[PDB]
Subunit: 235 residues, 4 copies
């Protein structure tokens, strides 16, 4: 049970995986979670039903996070349904791994546009909708790959390393109005394990609880920071 | 609040300030706190009575965290009282700020011995006692000065930067036994404020709750990490 | 001064500023420099004349480093002319500083496409043309803003932090063929003071000579590194 | 053929390994190198003779870099012989690897005092002797282990991570007098594990030495407080 002064959170790309776990974790901690899905609603709706059947507060919302007007419109609808938006998690993202010499600029842009510009739009709009209340916390879901790089991931590492640095700039622009911006860098989340000191993959739950901490009031003096969740894979 | 599988914690140098706060916070979330002091029990005893009067579990203990035998014997004593030790916070440290051309070697060793060797002994003995249980979390209280350095603090920055790197090595050695080692780097904790994006000093409680998270089950995939708690002063 | 096994280098956006200085420095060390410019040829031509009359080897080449086909064909031309290309410096980049709430997606993309995708293309083509000879060095001109962020520069910090992470992934992909990839992070440079420890802006030649070292044989065990050239402004 | 405004350099623990290559490299670029050694004069004196026979300027000096009074006396002897001291390389260092539960505080201190306290003394005395000239550059030889830690190296990682942070503090203190302080973090240097190194080989001592030379040289005049990785890609 983590303490939250805000009441609601938008999680982009939250139908499955880490984003889904973020939704369950934050819902179970008493926040109303907005589950963003791009295309099919069946998985998102099921996650929503699961949480409500547990007595939690959840809703789904359709928009492409890579789309400026779509994302903008959605935030407005959430401010119009709940009165505001206190928390944002930029989780949406894709991979298209290729050795760089086989990588077209279209493949580079596919990952940049979906992973970095999406988080720009989200952080920008959060700044607009939380500046009024002088309260908000935003978490950007980056990756160990943005910190250290990886074979075959020149485009993914660019998107996540640009995310990490973008977040710092947003932290300066939100700081006087008490809007915090931070990043999480998960390692390998469920041989790969041979290089992990904890000798196991991380659980999606373990990422989700690190996000919860950075959104929560307990991290109220943490901004512009990158929280590693990698089991020791990178120190 | 935060969930803890373990039951007790030892905090070095915990009579006041950040150390006292860590003791308060961890006591309020159900842990038995051992409040370490090395010379005068007064303030530490007031802390104990305060926490007990609020309904928490607390105890004082006298040893010099810079003495190997003192630290070792105190941890043995706590293991005898409680059956073991789940959590350790290496918080004890001193300053002796001087421009380096005025700094004697004894002024360098003063800070190293009180600040870095203390945390080596604590980290070492935590490994011994937590290894049996195959469970533990250890937080080293470092400082922004150990990340970026500072005019007049060649000795303190060496002690805290050494603390950060040491803790990474202990994280490797504790990992298979599920014993985690992390560092917190506080910034300016209650002209200087102008350089802080959040435009205020940090509260001691805001450091303590970051320490709480790193000890908690919620950070279960985080080891060898340094967590910045500095209001954006360093990114 | 410094020793180079390679014979030539392409420098993007080399008409003025740091990029011009890079050409001057590298030309004076015996390399044939290829001075890239986008529109105005006069300044680029004037630089070639200067370098040529001083007794060095220099050529200009027009193309938009943000344009995939332009960039690909230019490197093709240089390989046609010189037989190869041993060195690449991705220096081209633009700024469009705005507070994020004033920033259109179009403004974010303007900087991403011109700063990040341009460097991706150059790095990718370097991999292709350098791999046969199993030799080369590539330097990416990033920025302190990519390391610590800056208010009003969510887009520039994104592109340069993305550049930094990118470069590391290229270092993995080039490593086995001895193709090195490193970044330089300049501070405040005169052509581009209280908080700067050296108490002055950096000269463009001071950036150029750090780039030269990373291209040189002297840095032959250095790859995936980011070299800070900021007068102590960031440590 | 890097450019140096200064004329001489002291390299602690320079009789072999990386420190010896630093002396070779820097002597071949025209500096008078002072080769520090602790006990064995034979290898240092062979090195000195090797360099002099190639036309370079070299000298040996015996002292313990971990002894404040020795280190202090040695630098006044160099100032006495040469008129000043432009450059300093804190290379002296040892290892005593043990799992932490088997390591006594005295094994911790042995590494702290030999690796970290020595670099403090050297940096401090550099500040003193370089101040009046308002010119100077100092390189601290740290390690990848100080950046990321290592199993069995809680003492070594502490000394070298402390050296890296401490060097940044010296950079602030020397900056207005234009005395630069920088660190190098070599990876695995010759004199399996090679699988994790992207460049697929151990580094040559010469490759560390030339990185050191660059940070000493005029080419790095706007670089201070920096840590230069020299690890073949092992840590990025």
């Amino acid at each position: 049970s983590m303490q939250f002064t805000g009441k609601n959170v938008l999680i982009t790309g939250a139908s499955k995986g880490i984003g889904a776990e973020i939704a369950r974790t934050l819902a179970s901690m008493g926040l109303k979670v907005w589950i963003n899905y791009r295309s099919n609603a069946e998985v998102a709706d099921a996650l929503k039903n699961e949480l409500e059947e547990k007595g939690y507060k959840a809703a789904v919302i359709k928009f492409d996070a890579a789309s400026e007007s779509d994302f903008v419109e959605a935030i407005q609808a959430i401010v119009q349904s709940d009165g505001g938006l206190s928390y944002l998690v930029n989780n949406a993202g894709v991979v298209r791994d290729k050795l760089a010499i086989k990588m077209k600029t279209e493949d580079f842009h596919h990952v940049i546009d979906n992973n970095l510009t999406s988080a720009f739009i989200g952080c920008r709009e959060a700044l607009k909708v939380m500046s009024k209340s002088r309260f908000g916390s935003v978490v950007n879901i980056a990756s160990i790959i943005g910190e250290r790089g990886n074979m075959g991931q020149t485009n993914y590492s660019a998107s996540k390393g640009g995310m990490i640095a973008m977040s710092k700039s947003f932290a300066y622009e939100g700081a006087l109005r008490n809007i915090r911006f931070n990043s999480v860098t998960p390692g390998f989340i469920e041989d790969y394990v041979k290089n992990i000191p904890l000798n196991r993959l991380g659980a999606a739950k373990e990422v989700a609880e690190a996000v919860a901490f950075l959104l929560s009031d307990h991290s109220s003096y943490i901004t512009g920071e990158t929280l590693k969740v990698n089991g020791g894979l990178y120190m």
